[PDB]
Design a protein around this ligand. Structure first.
Ligand code: HEM
Ligand SMILES: [Sm+3]
Length: 449
């Protein structure tokens, strides 16, 4: 028997879930407990809520709870290959290969950090071209992250004004947005995807082809180059010109959106609480010049700044319910039993906002990550990157982008709102998975002695 449940109806249990599913998955947990199941239609999907329930599942029964379960995305000659979504047959392989080559130095001498650093300069510059006038960071803030992945996968980066680039983005974004929350053709919704999916798929392949005309003696300089030089276990293996693309897509897609909506969310919080921004800057001037740009090395000597970036991820809870998971056979979780194929969804919000781990969890306070003896890190219910064997793949470089980008914008800029802090909304709306911040405008005022 599966975990208890909010009694279905026939063709649904959507009976009681809002536009904040995580808000009611917790109403449910308040009864059925840490493990209950609901019916997102006709199929059962058990929910893991306590922190213990989540770690235990995701960490302890690792291979047991390592699935997903979905279909659309695999529509236009889109085989179930790639990194996010799909069968271990291509997962385990395309994942492994991804985790390794996406290591800071998994692509020759030009580390991913150097790459994050280059974009960071470009970000600060173009933020400058803002001439200190009101502005909506939503654009440029999504530019930096798209280019970082552009940089670690093609080796090139694009101009924030470059048509083809803006087009690449137009696509990645519409698709993710037209795909929300965990014979239904509306269906204009479907032809657009195909369109967009197609543009992405091309853009990528165009680079894959030109990337073929030039590589080295194990001197690959980026993802593609690394993949390409994978003619092992005969000509192709799992490596295949099409499986490739699907990965570069999931990397772009998952990699571009999340990071951007966080940087955009970070500034709002710093505008919302400028004392934090001031102390981050104290810390910046104090350990990093006013001159040189930041490098990852600095982070270890900057507890407060790190406490903040940490607190921002915990507080914004970008993915209340992360990506859908699905067990791979049978599993007797606690006194229960879940059958092969069941959909699992883990309430990360529930861990990220645990009140014993992070006192007033609903309060933005870098304190949640500092010790009452000078600033100094801490942490453990810190699972915004999930925690399974399906944990984020970009985690590493994502953590950099945040620290490097953020830190460098605050090194070079004073952030001024257009409305008293006691008057701007920082409440999230939840576009499906992702929690997106409100809309705000701001001026990036240059600093210089
Ligand atoms: C603000 C930064 C980021 C956050 C909070 C974040 C978080 C997550 C979460 C919660 C998941 C799915 C949860 C699960 O299935 O267990 C995920 C999946 C993944 N992420 Fe991100 N991520 C971030 C950045 C990135 C970046 C920059 C990349 C790409 C270079 C990346 C690529 C992926 C991919 C490919 C997956 C699917 C992994 C799999 O199925 O095994 N992420 N991420
Ligand atoms: Sm469009």
């Amino acid at each position: 028997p599966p975990g208890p449940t909010p009694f279905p109806i026939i063709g649904n249990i959507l009976q009681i879930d809002a536009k904040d599913i995580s808000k009611s998955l917790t109403k449910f947990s308040e009864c059925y407990g840490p493990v209950f199941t609901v019916y997102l239609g006709m199929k059962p999907t058990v929910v893991l809520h306590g922190y213990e329930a989540v770690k235990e599942a995701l960490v302890d029964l690792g291979e047991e709870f390592a699935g997903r379960g979905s279909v659309p995305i695999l529509e236009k000659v889109s085989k179930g290959l790639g990194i996010a979504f799909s069968n271990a047959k291509t997962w385990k392989e395309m994942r492994r290969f991804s985790l390794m080559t996406l290591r800071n130095f998994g692509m020759g001498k030009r580390s991913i950090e150097d790459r994050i650093q280059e974009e960071a300069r470009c970000l600060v510059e173009e933020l400058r071209k803002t001439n200190a006038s009101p502005c909506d960071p939503t654009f440029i803030l999504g530019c930096a992250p798209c280019n970082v992945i552009c940089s670690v996968i093609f080796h090139n980066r694009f101009d924030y004004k470059d048509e083809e680039f803006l087009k690449l983005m137009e696509s990645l974004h519409e698709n993710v947005e037209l795909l929300g929350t965990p014979l239904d053709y509306f269906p204009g919704i479907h032809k657009t995807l195909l369109k967009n999916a197609d543009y992405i798929k091309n853009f990528i392949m165009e680079k894959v082809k030109e990337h073929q005309k030039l590589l080295d003696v194990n001197n690959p300089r980026d993802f593609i180059d690394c993949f390409l030089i994978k003619m092992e276990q005969e000509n192709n293996l799992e490596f295949t010109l099409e499986s490739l693309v699907i990965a570069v897509s999931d990397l772009f897609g998952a990699g571009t959106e999340t990071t951007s909506t966080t940087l955009r969310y970070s500034l709002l919080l710093l505008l919302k609480h400028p004392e934090v921004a001031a102390r981050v800057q104290e810390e910046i001037e104090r350990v990093i010049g006013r001159h040189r740009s930041p490098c990852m090395q600095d982070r270890s000597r900057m507890p407060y700044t790190d406490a903040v970036i940490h607190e921002i991820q915990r507080f914004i809870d970008l993915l209340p319910t992360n990506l859908p998971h699905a067990v791979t056979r049978d599993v007797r979780f606690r006194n229960y039993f879940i059958p092969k194929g069941t959909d699992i969804i883990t309430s990360l919000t529930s861990v990220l906002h645990d009140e014993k781990a992070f006192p007033n969890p609903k309060v933005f306070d870098p304190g949640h990550f500092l010790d009452e003896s000078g600033n100094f890190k801490k942490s453990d219910y810190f699972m915004p990157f999930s925690a399974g064997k399906r944990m984020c793949v970009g985690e590493g470089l994502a953590r950099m982008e945040l620290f490097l980008f953020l830190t460098s914008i605050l090194q070079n800029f004073k952030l001024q709102s257009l409305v008293e802090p006691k008057d701007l909304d920082i409440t999230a709306v939840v576009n499906g998975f992702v929690s997106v911040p409100p809309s705000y405008q701001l001026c990036f005022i240059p600093i210089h002695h």
